[PDB]
Scaffold this active site. Structure first.
Site, PDB file in Angstrom:
ATOM      1  N   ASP A 274      -0.776  -8.978   7.290  1.00 36.63           N
ATOM      2  CA  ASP A 274      -1.635  -7.889   6.848  1.00 36.63           C
ATOM      3  C   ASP A 274      -0.935  -7.113   5.736  1.00 36.63           C
ATOM      4  O   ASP A 274      -0.371  -6.050   5.973  1.00 36.63           O
ATOM      5  CB  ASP A 274      -1.933  -6.962   8.023  1.00 36.63           C
ATOM      6  CG  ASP A 274      -3.098  -6.043   7.755  1.00 36.63           C
ATOM      7  OD1 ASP A 274      -3.667  -6.103   6.647  1.00 36.63           O
ATOM      8  OD2 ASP A 274      -3.447  -5.256   8.657  1.00 36.63           O
TER       9      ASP A 274
ATOM     10  N   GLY B   2      -8.301   4.522   9.664  1.00 37.80           N
ATOM     11  CA  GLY B   2      -8.422   5.064   8.327  1.00 37.80           C
ATOM     12  C   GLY B   2      -7.121   5.159   7.552  1.00 37.80           C
ATOM     13  O   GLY B   2      -7.136   5.390   6.350  1.00 37.80           O
TER      14      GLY B   2
ATOM     15  N   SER C  13      -4.972   2.647   7.538  1.00 40.10           N
ATOM     16  CA  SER C  13      -4.639   1.275   7.184  1.00 40.10           C
ATOM     17  C   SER C  13      -4.114   1.189   5.758  1.00 40.10           C
ATOM     18  O   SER C  13      -4.697   1.774   4.836  1.00 40.10           O
ATOM     19  CB  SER C  13      -5.870   0.381   7.312  1.00 40.10           C
ATOM     20  OG  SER C  13      -6.309   0.330   8.653  1.00 40.10           O
ATOM     21  N   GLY C  14      -3.012   0.460   5.586  1.00 32.43           N
ATOM     22  CA  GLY C  14      -2.429   0.298   4.263  1.00 32.43           C
ATOM     23  C   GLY C  14      -1.449   1.387   3.880  1.00 32.43           C
ATOM     24  O   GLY C  14      -0.713   1.244   2.919  1.00 32.43           O
TER      25      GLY C  14
ATOM     26  N   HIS D 296      -6.229  -6.477   5.265  1.00 31.63           N
ATOM     27  CA  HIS D 296      -7.540  -6.304   5.885  1.00 31.63           C
ATOM     28  C   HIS D 296      -8.448  -5.249   5.261  1.00 31.63           C
ATOM     29  O   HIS D 296      -9.651  -5.250   5.499  1.00 31.63           O
ATOM     30  CB  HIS D 296      -7.413  -6.066   7.395  1.00 31.63           C
ATOM     31  CG  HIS D 296      -7.104  -4.653   7.775  1.00 31.63           C
ATOM     32  ND1 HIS D 296      -5.819  -4.173   7.889  1.00 31.63           N
ATOM     33  CD2 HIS D 296      -7.921  -3.630   8.121  1.00 31.63           C
ATOM     34  CE1 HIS D 296      -5.856  -2.917   8.298  1.00 31.63           C
ATOM     35  NE2 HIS D 296      -7.121  -2.564   8.447  1.00 31.63           N
TER      36      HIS D 296
END
Ligand SMILES: CCCOc1ccc2[nH]cc(C[C@@H](NS(=O)(=O)CC)C(=O)N[C@@H](CCC(N)=O)C(=O)NCc3ccc(C(=N)N)cc3)c2c1
Ligand SMILES: *[C@@H]1O[C@H](CO)[C@@H](O)[C@H](O)[C@H]1O
Ligand SMILES: *[C@@H]1O[C@@H](C)[C@@H](O)[C@@H](O)[C@@H]1O
Ligand SMILES: [Ca+2]
Ligand SMILES: [Ca+2]
Ligand SMILES: [Ca+2]
Ligand SMILES: [Ca+2]
Ligand SMILES: [Ca+2]
Ligand SMILES: [Ca+2]
Ligand SMILES: [Ca+2]
Ligand SMILES: [Ca+2]
Ligand SMILES: [Ca+2]
Lengths: 254, 142, 191
Positions: A90, A190, A192-193, A41
């Site tokens: 994701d 923030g 994410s990943g 995403h």
């Protein structure tokens, strides 16, 4: 990160900082000198594919030392089954244009074998999640890399312990919960990943990816991470494959 | 127990229930009071559940009321000490003692493996780095 | 398959076995137990029985609260068990009067301190070694009228009438408790 603490410089050596047009975008996880694992995403609204930068050895966004290494992302591989704006699958596999130098401040996290992670790591209660994300739900992002120890839950327990929010994303077999439901600790948008690293008998392994959740550290809710063990064979076949012409590539999945 | 004329003799716990087996009636004649008779009868008539020697592999049986408890030897466990702690060398049990990877093997014993950048030591369960910066290790602490 | 149910803790002197239902029909089980912040440890691997001895795990820290879960096989189906804190819930085994000596007008009733499942230095700890001051034994006697006595050790020193005989019976007890505060009555013994 919400309710955590600063990762001492060098103690989160695989954390990757992702930028788009010099701007902070997402976290990531180095798993070898050439590949970085992140969340799909993080690329939903990207338009300038030639402007993706992966920074390693980072710590303090406000200072500059020689442990910082930069590389252009030569390729973002997202599963074909992923839908922008949604939550399933994701995950993204980023090929760096030029390998990075392994040093005391830049080291990859081990990508484990499917069964080892499902049969062993998955039952290791605590794992570390990290990033330069928001310190509070809707607050400003962190200047120094933050890390948080979060307890893992099997989906049945997650659902049972979570408050229902009609028409909210389903927790699939490609996800899993981790965190607390008291509103004090969880990862945030923030981050994410970023990685969800599990410590086991001397070695740290990649078990999850900061993916989503009902806001950030919401009471009656837990964070949701991409269950990496479901993509081991996916990631390995791709890392052995030839680089495609374009930057963005959608690879079938399974 | 009863014999010819002994009933003429007053009651005795020693001669009737200790030196012989005594029914509830004989017992009731010794304690008189109902409750006192019951308090005695529960244990006296329960029977040693350890008679069958249920505890295995050298365990020790301690009798309870209509039940028992087994005390096993260090290398055993289970209600009757039937479980051999050494016969559990499979991967799903604490990763088969392996440091990194574990592989089951029908019949034989499980084998241990390692992640790239490491090699299996002589003990057949540990892994040591074979490069300067193996994955999952933090330099400023090693 | 079907998730197990009615998980229950059967425990006495720390001998702790977890039981459940139903009777496995084309399905095996695997138990996992842990402390609220510890890792999950598997037990009774692929067993076809509906029970699982966890004594060795819970005696590592009897004051810890444990959580167990039973997995069903033909993430898999499972059921969580009731929380279990050994120290506060294990049952006190039936006592045994070790003896009693008469000294004029008094009698010293001795309660055999029975062993528990808790190991330590290659030996089994007594109920006294574990509960310490939390344990008291009580005597229910009578001049073979009702009478009682309490001690914070393993012996009762009481008065008695010369000539007459006495019967005794004791019970292990943890006053602080609320549930399982007392054991069953020991067998009756008479001087
Ligand atoms: C447009 C239709 C949206 O429909 C709904 C309706 C109900 C919902 N409940 C939860 C979400 C899902 C949504 N959460 S929300 O806070 O934005 C909304 C509550 C959500 O999490 N969306 C994704 C992006 C979806 C995309 N691909 O664009 C997201 O923001 N991921 C980052 C992230 C990382 C960590 C945490 C954490 N560790 N808590 C939280 C968020 C959701 C979405
Ligand atoms: C000895 O007696 C007990 C009584 O319950 C029984 O459970 C055992 O199977 C037997 O060996
Ligand atoms: C009873 O306890 C068990 C554990 C063994 O020590 C036996 O020898 C003993 O009689
Ligand atoms: Ca910097
Ligand atoms: Ca007789
Ligand atoms: Ca008789
Ligand atoms: Ca008689
Ligand atoms: Ca006789
Ligand atoms: Ca005699
Ligand atoms: Ca009669
Ligand atoms: Ca008679
Ligand atoms: Ca008995």
């Amino acid at each position: 990160i919400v309710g955590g603490k600063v990762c001492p410089k060098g103690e989160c050596p695989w954390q990757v900082l992702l930028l788009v047009n010099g701007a902070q975008l997402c976290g990531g996880t180095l798993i070898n000198t050439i590949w970085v694992v992140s969340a799909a995403h993080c690329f939903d609204k990207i338009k300038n594919w030639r402007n993706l930068i992966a920074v390693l050895g980072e710590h303090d966004l406000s200072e500059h030392d020689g442990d910082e290494q930069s590389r252009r992302v030569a390729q973002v591989i997202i599963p074909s089954t992923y839908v922008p704006g949604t939550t399933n699958h994701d995950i993204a596999l980023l090929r760096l244009h030029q390998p990075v130098v392994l040093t005391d401040h830049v080291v990859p996290l081990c990508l484990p074998e499917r069964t080892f992670s499902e049969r062993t790591l998955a039952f290791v209660r605590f794992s570390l999640v990290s990033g330069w994300g928001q310190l509070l739900d809707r607050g400003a992002t962190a200047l120094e890399l933050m890390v948080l120890n979060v307890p893992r839950l099997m989906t049945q327990d997650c659902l049972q312990q979570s408050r229902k929010v009609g028409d909210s994303p389903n927790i699939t077999e490609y996800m899993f919960c981790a965190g607390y439901s008291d509103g004090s600790k969880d990862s945030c948008k923030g981050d994410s990943g970023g990685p969800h690293a599990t410590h086991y008998r001397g070695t740290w392994y990649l078990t999850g990816i900061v993916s989503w959740g009902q806001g950030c550290a919401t009471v009656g809710h837990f964070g949701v991470y991409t269950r990496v063990s479901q993509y081991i064979e996916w990631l390995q076949k791709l890392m052995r494959s030839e680089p495609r012409p374009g930057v963005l590539l959608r690879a079938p999945f399974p | 127990a009863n014999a010819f004329l002994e009933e003429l003799r007053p009651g005795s716990l020693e001669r009737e229930c200790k030196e012989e087996q005594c029914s509830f009636e004989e017992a009731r004649e010794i304690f008189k009071d109902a409750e006192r008779t019951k308090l005695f009868w529960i244990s006296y008539s329960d029977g040693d559940q350890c008679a069958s020697s249920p505890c295995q592999n050298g365990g020790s049986c301690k009798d309870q009321l209509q039940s028992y408890i087994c005390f096993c030897l260090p290398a055993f466990e289970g209600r009757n000490c039937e479980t051999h702690k050494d016969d559990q060398l499979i991967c799903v049990n604490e990763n088969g003692g392996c440091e990194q990877y574990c592989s089951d093997h029908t019949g034989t014993k499980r084998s241990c493996r390692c992640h790239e950048g490491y090699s299996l030591l002589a003990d057949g369960v540990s892994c040591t780095p074979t490069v300067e910066y193996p994955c999952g290790k933090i330099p400023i602490l090693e | 398959t079907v998730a197990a149910y009615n998980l229950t803790w059967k425990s006495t002197n720390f001998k702790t076995i977890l039981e459940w239902e139903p009777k496995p029909v084309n399905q095996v089980y695997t138990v996992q137990i842990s402390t609220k912040s510890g890792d999950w440890k598997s037990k009774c691997f692929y067993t076809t029985d509906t029970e699982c001895d966890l004594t060795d795990e819970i005696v590592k820290d009897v004051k810890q609260t444990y959580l167990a879960r039973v997995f069903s096989y033909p993430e898999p189906l499972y059921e969580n068990s009731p929380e279990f804190t050994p120290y506060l819930e294990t049952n006190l085994g039936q006592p045994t009067i070790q003896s009693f000596e008469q000294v004029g007008t008094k009698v010293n009733v001795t309660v055999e301190d029975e062993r528990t499942l808790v190991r330590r230095n290659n030996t089994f700890l007594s109920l006294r070694d574990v509960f310490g001051k939390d344990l008291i034994y009580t005597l229910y006697y009578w001049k073979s009228g009702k009478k009682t006595a309490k001690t914070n050790t393993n012996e009762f020193l009481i008065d008695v009438d010369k000539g007459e005989n006495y019967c005794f019976s004791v019970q292990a007890v943890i006053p602080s408790r609320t549930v399982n505060r007392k054991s069953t009555d020991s067998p009756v013994e008479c001087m």
